Amino acid sequence: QIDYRDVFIEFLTTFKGNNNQNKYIERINELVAYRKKSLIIEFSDVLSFNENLAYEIINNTKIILPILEGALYDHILQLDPTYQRDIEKVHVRIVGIPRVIELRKIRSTDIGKLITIDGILVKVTPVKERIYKATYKHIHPDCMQEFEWPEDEEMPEVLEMPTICPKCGKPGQFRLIPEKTKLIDWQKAVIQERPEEVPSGQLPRQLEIILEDDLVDSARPGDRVKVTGILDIKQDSPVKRGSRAVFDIYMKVSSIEVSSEEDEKKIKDLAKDPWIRDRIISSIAPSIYGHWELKEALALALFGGVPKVLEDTRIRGDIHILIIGDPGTAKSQMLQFISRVAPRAVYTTGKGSTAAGLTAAVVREKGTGEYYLEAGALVLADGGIAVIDEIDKMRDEDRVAIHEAMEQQTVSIAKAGIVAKLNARAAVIAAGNPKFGRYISERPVSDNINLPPTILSRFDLIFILKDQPGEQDRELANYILDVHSGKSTKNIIDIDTLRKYIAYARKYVTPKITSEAKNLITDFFVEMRKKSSETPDSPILITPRQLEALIRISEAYAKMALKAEVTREDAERAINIMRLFLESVGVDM
């Protein structure tokens, strides 16, 4: 038996990273400066430094975590006495446990160990307080004594009151003292297994987890997470008998991850190539032949524009795309790829969606009997991409409910005496089919779309796809068979790198409008408005929302190349793609 306090402190102060910069030393300095009261330690670093220490942490986690926390607290206090009186104690969290078990394969033998489960967050409860050291008061004409009922022991999960007053050795009734009671933050969350690991013909399972102290509010619903901790059984009503000798299992979260310096370096060198825009476009849906304009348009929606917020109003900075085409034109394949490449995307269908399920659901809690809101599909997709397949197959009554969300990016709910406004800053991608299944050349655009002009004006770009057999049939057949044969096209950025590239660009890039683009946009907008009045029978209208599109598209083009200003070249690209949108629908230039 050898003390690990010296080894743990030595590991923190002597570990060398990639550049031998003592990374953990900097984290401690950040912890001291910010009073973060929590430290994250990578498991492989501990294993590389000393494999014997790693095994004790994995196995004897129950009794070794407080030892390391106490030793670390002394080191922090030695480094800076001012850290005291602000943080009572620190927490050590281990990340990178080699023991990973699927949510569906949890057995009795795994209870009481430190295991890691990766899943999807579903529900998060509001933060609440849990008592871990109570202070009762035996009220009785002779007692007038207060005491901490749990002696040299933490208050268990089941609340219990003293039976005999220790100060007097007599029975009676006891009163809790909130002022001297010690509390700890407590949150309840529910995790779900990934759809790619669910067995065939079975519904996904769910597991409930506990977040405490600083771990609260570490994630939002719909985010892939990785958690590590100790499993335990759950007790709800143990006071009254009636068998129920079967208990569930809940997880005590110790370390939580969501979804680096080296990644930024990899991303930065990509933008050095002048042809970065073409590479990104060619990397969208590599298994789909042709549709270069559609592929180019989808890339703009992934990056999006720059939202503008003023002292009196705000302007949306998202691009909405509507695609209409004949069946079999691979409209859904691109949408599925978007949902798999975007950092945050939600995939829905017209028939499988409802008005309540798309914006906000008002439900009544049976335990409380009061109404409370539930996040809709658009709300969960805030700051991301919203995909609505088969937009024409949903009822118009439910479809018209998203008019405010598509433009104002807000959802107003006035039901059951509850009034609220929720942010819905998401870009909507919709696909559908013409009124008669296939597009009819002889019939005009009005009866083919079969959609009200109001919703059409909210779409920045509208593309019409036509399945016309011709000279491209032979090359299309070869491409499809190559995909089925396993052959793939190289010189394509992988999905993981592309997803990282999109996330980085949306966070650290904000292009500015220059004078050259201002003149180019104005001339095109005025000229295209003049042609609109020539043929006012088209279902589409050239509204001021169209002028908004050029600014957003130009910003998206600049954001693609990690630029800082909208140059003259970007304005030309925005005009070129805008012309194709007008040309496809039936408006000549």
Place this chain on the structure above:
Amino acid sequence: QIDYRDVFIEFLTTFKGNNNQNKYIERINELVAYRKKSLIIEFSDVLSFNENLAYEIINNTKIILPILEGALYDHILQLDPTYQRDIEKVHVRIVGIPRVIELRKIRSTDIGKLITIDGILVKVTPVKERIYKATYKHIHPDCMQEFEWPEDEEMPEVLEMPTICPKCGKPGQFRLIPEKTKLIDWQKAVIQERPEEVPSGQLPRQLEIILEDDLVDSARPGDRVKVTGILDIKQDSPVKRGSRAVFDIYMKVSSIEVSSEEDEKKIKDLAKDPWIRDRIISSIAPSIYGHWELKEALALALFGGVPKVLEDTRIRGDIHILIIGDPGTAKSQMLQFISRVAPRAVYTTGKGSTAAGLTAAVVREKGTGEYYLEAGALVLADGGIAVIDEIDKMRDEDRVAIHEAMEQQTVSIAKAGIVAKLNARAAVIAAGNPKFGRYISERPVSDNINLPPTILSRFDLIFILKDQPGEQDRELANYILDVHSGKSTKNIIDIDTLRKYIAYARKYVTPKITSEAKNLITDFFVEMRKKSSETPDSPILITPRQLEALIRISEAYAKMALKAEVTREDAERAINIMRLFLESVGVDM
């Protein structure tokens, strides 16, 4: 007087199997490799070796079973001393009990003996944990003692706390320690009697079964199982008085089997026949005369293609068949046969089904008032075949809800704040009648089918059946009367053998496309588009989906012969069969 501990040991190690290889020794050796912890014993094997032990097992199971487990553990321990500290005990499961009782014939005299029940699983609860050895601490300021209350006795299904502390002989308050508590896996399932056993008029009855230890998650809902164990009465609140001395019956499962190496050699022998494809086609619906092209198409759907999973998207590998015919053409006859020979099939009707029930339904459980997902018809058919009879009779607004599942093989639900995706990789076979009941040659094909072009393109093959009274009436009449007279057709593979053949092919066979097949497929696909453009009047469209139909059919043809490569011969059959399909819908090539 006589001990069976040594009797069981020699039976395991000295028992000549069918091939005289000591199969039970191999099973024990296989058990050690992966720590199976469960050994399956055939009742016939015990009866063949020593009849005396057979009666003891079947009549005194509750006593002799633990004794045999101890003997087996020592034998395994000697073979592998390392078997300790991972598997503390093993289990002995007995199958093939001759005592089989119908679910409706259970009486009081059937309680307490080992019986076998055949039925259909309908509900599986999530895996939970049951306490069988608790650990309590007496909360009395003088005690501080830890003890296991269920001493010298397994903890009953009704949880009970001690009234007097064993180590101090005093009453008071007791607390349970989860860390020192011993748990065991516990799962609840519901079984239903087969439709062939339900008597006239009444609805089928249900029985509750309990699965423990490794038996959890041994089967999925909708499967046919054969459970074996001891019946017992169910109690919830025995303390709660107020009459009601009537108790239900719950089933304690000890061994469950769902639905041998001799099958593989028998299956391999069948595939060696060069005319295996013809024999399989002739073995589909032996009671139906004619319809050779329809029989061949149905065989392809049973086997199906090879799904492709890529890093970005996935390609559907199932084949969908649509049949349109006049009444009396026995369309529903093969559909019933398909649902009987397929390893996993679900039979539905257009009128008796709704959109919610087809894919997924969101229902509110009154126990908690919270919405939860319910598996639909397509979800439960994942990995199998879904049959939709009388598709034309059902509502159009309900038919559009399955467009996504038939191509993307996924179901998306956004209702009441619930967003999820479910896999629905199931082949769809549909039948229906024309617009005016009978087919009319004077009217064009477009208005006769009366279906939207979108759903028509999804189907791989569409066959139109016409009832023309000709010279074949006498031949058809004789065949029908022969069936009614008890005469049957010989030299046909039985359903039991055919079902085994199909299951083996779909698992261990994965054909690949060759260069020769690519040229034939590409040339014929181009011919479709050229012919289709020449006649823009047919309601069917030659979309790129038809190209995948050639690939899927070619793979299915190769899979029927247990081949690994799709040769030119398979490609020619794929081209030939679709030529008939095009001819049926009035397209001549």
Place this chain on the structure above:
DNA sequence: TTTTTTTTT
């Protein structure tokens, strides 16, 4: 009652 999805007069 009121809001939600569902099958049903």
